Structure 1
Amino acid sequence: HSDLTFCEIILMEMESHDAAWPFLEPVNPRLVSGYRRIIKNPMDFSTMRERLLRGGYTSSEEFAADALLVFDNCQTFNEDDSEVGKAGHIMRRFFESRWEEFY
């Protein structure tokens, strides 16, 4: 139980983070050229929220893998000096820091 309660805390904190705006919604491949071809396993906070609210996370490690997937995809598709890349570096450092601040 305590494993999944922290997942809720950190996802809520990521959802309300100032830098979360690229990650709240699944990328629309119709509007983002090349996204379908380049990113094999899309992930975003709303997709993690759906899975967490339906109980679909077995452990905290499945949850973190989805979180790290958001930021791996971000760095794969976006330049580090792009607006989205900069937002994702902020969010990745937040997650890694807060996740270690617990375990």
Structure 2
Amino acid sequence: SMHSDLTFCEIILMEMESHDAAWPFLEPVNPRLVSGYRRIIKNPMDFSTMRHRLSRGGYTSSEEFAADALLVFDNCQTFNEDDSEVGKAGHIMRRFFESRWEEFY
């Protein structure tokens, strides 16, 4: 299970999931809603997957957690146009994450 030293990451993830721009990223990108995603995106990532990995002890370090968060946003800017709703959401959430992270780093 998660080590207590990573509780600040747990909270950051919780706060990201509650964000108004979080809706595209709560669950894995859904093939029922869009085609060709995993054709392009080699390592999908989403907040639910991160939440379970963190809670079960699958992140040894905060940097691995941060790498998966940045992966959510990097995938988003890879697949989506910047002026699409999901693309704009990704830019918002990246700013939110980096501002939360810099309180600690």
Q: Work out the CA distance in 1 between the residues paired with 2:94 and 2:33.
A: 24
Structure 1: runs of 5+ lacking an equivalent: none
Detail structure 1 runs of 4+ shifted over 4 Å in the superposition: none
Task: List per-residue Cα deviations over 1:24-55 (Å, max 9, x = no partner).
Answer: 01011343121011100000000000101111
Q: Work out the CA distance in 2 between the residues paired with 1:55 and 1:16.
A: 22
Corresponding residue to 1:70 among 59, 69, 72: 72
Deviates more, 1:29-38 or 1:14-23: 29-38
Instruction: Provide the TM-score with structure 2 as the length reference.
Output: 0.93
Deviates more, 1:24-33 or 1:56-65: 24-33
Alignment: residue pair count: 103
Structure 2: runs of 5+ lacking an equivalent: none
Instruction: Provide the TM-score with structure 1 as the length reference.
Output: 0.94
Q: Work out the CA distance in 2 between the residues paired with 1:77 and 1:88.
A: 11
